[PDB]
Write a protein that binds this ligand. Structure first.
Ligand SMILES: Cc1cccc(C(=O)N2CCC(C(N)=O)CC2)c1
Ligand SMILES: Cc1cccc(C(=O)N2CCC(C(N)=O)CC2)c1
Lengths: 263, 264
């Protein structure tokens, strides 16, 4: 992997692995999400980091508020995919990281993703607007003019997501993380929540459809000893409304939507 | 990745990923096991496959009977590890696949692994001895003289493993696979069983010890709608454990194993 010529974006190539593919011999959406995370980490590392100097002193961290992924073609086992990533400041609200996925042989865009990140105190878990010192430190690594993976006006990445009402049409209950689901900081990996959301989609839909779009809002983390219920209702291609909540008290942890295309 | 000069083994390099590491910022044993599987798959593909022509005609497949891994140093996040793999015939019993893990910068051996594979009919699930036709078809891809990742006389990879007796000292109950745990053939990935075994090791042991050796026997697979219980009892600067995976309902054994840990 390497920063591009202008130093304002990062590219990396990946060979799709045998255990990274599903029953159609193409990468799953969780494999795609893991590769987006990996290229994001490699970009932060290449430019000196993604906590800045000022963030470390104030005990501030970036946390994902929303993830939006659109896949046109999933790469097959053995294929090489090239992923380009970059970040942009969104004023005092937070930051955005975008990605473009391309087939390395054809050079064609096979997917795109966007994510919204907010600043949070790592100990109290309280959100905070971005100060001048934090930006400026961050802004020299971002394009200054807007660069959007999802430019279109009224695109799917900015749609408001409603709360699923009981009863759910489908469900998968009692989902619990194992050690493989944790990151190096002993927090549940963001990609695990994508898997848990997908758990309540019926197998018949997975067997006959391909996931085209997923939008996920992150409200709260699955903490030590928490158990999750995954709920889904068809709203319609087939569209679904999703809700992840704690098994016990019903506290919301995520809400999302998926759009599927018949194979 | 590429076959070596003589065409009898295969090597591949991997850069350890951010999500592949644990709290120590080094690859987990499940990441190592996934990389062993990936390099094995790439070796079978490079030589024309790992079902041979005669196996596909008779609906026969290779299945893992045992996996044995020893790690001296886990590679750190961003490090490059080089893995060499090869297969050997073990007469009519089955086949063996071995691996050697090396630090790409120093060239030093940081781990080794060995696995025993048996032939089985895909449909009935019945095991069977290796015939001459099958044996001849894969012998041209194997070294003829013995080549062992674990050569030593009384090595840990060939130890008999006893069955854990109730009550277990530790347990993790109701473990169930999600779609990410399945392979392209809709079977639970062999590496998931390694994770499930490790689930019943207490967090305090994980925090203060490093896993040095794991030996796992595969007896039966976790099938559609099956739920697993993971049981562990200490048998022992080192700590040894006895492990048992069994179905939550009837208590049917799916795996048994042992782990050896050393204090950090
Ligand atoms: C640190 C953390 C953060 C969030 C959730 C968990 C948790 O509830 N686990 C994962 C690991 C655990 C184990 N010891 O196997 C079983 C359940 C742990
Ligand atoms: C095909 C197979 C083989 C072995 C076990 C399972 C199983 O029990 N699952 C995994 C996926 C499933 C789902 N539909 O989310 C929930 C439980 C499925």
């Amino acid at each position: 992997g390497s920063l591009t010529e202008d130093g304002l974006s990062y590219k990396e190539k990946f060979v799709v692995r045998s255990y990274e593919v599903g029953s159609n011999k193409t990468a799953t959406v969780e494999t795609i999400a893991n590769l987006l995370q990996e290229v994001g980490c490699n970009h932060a590392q290449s430019v000196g980091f993604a906590t800045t100097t000022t963030m470390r002193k104030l005990h501030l961290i970036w946390v994902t508020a929303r993830m939006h992924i659109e896949i046109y073609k999933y790469p097959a086992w053995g294929d090489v995919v090239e992923i380009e990533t970059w970040c942009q400041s969104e004023g005092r609200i937070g930051t955005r990281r975008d990605w473009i996925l391309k087939d390395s042989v054809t050079g064609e865009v096979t997917g795109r993703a966007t994510s919204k990140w907010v600043m949070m105190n790592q100990d109290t878990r309280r959100l905070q607007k971005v100060s001048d010192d934090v930006r400026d430190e961050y802004l020299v690594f971002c394009p200054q003019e807007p660069r959007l993976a999802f430019p279109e006006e009224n695109n799917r990445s900015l749609k408001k997501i409603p709360k699923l009402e009981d009863p759910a049409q489908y469900s998968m209950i009692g989902l619990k993380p194992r050690r493989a689901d944790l990151d190096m900081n002993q927090h549940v990996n963001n990609v695990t929540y994508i898997g848990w959301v997908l758990e309540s989609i019926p197998q018949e839909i997975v067997d006959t459809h391909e996931l085209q779009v997923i939008t996920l809002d992150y409200r709260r983390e699955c903490q030590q000893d928490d158990v999750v219920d995954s709920l889904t209702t068809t709203t319609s291609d087939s569209q679904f409304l999703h809700l992840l909540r704690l098994s016990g008290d019903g506290q919301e942890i995520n809400r999302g939507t998926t759009l599927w295309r018949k194979k």
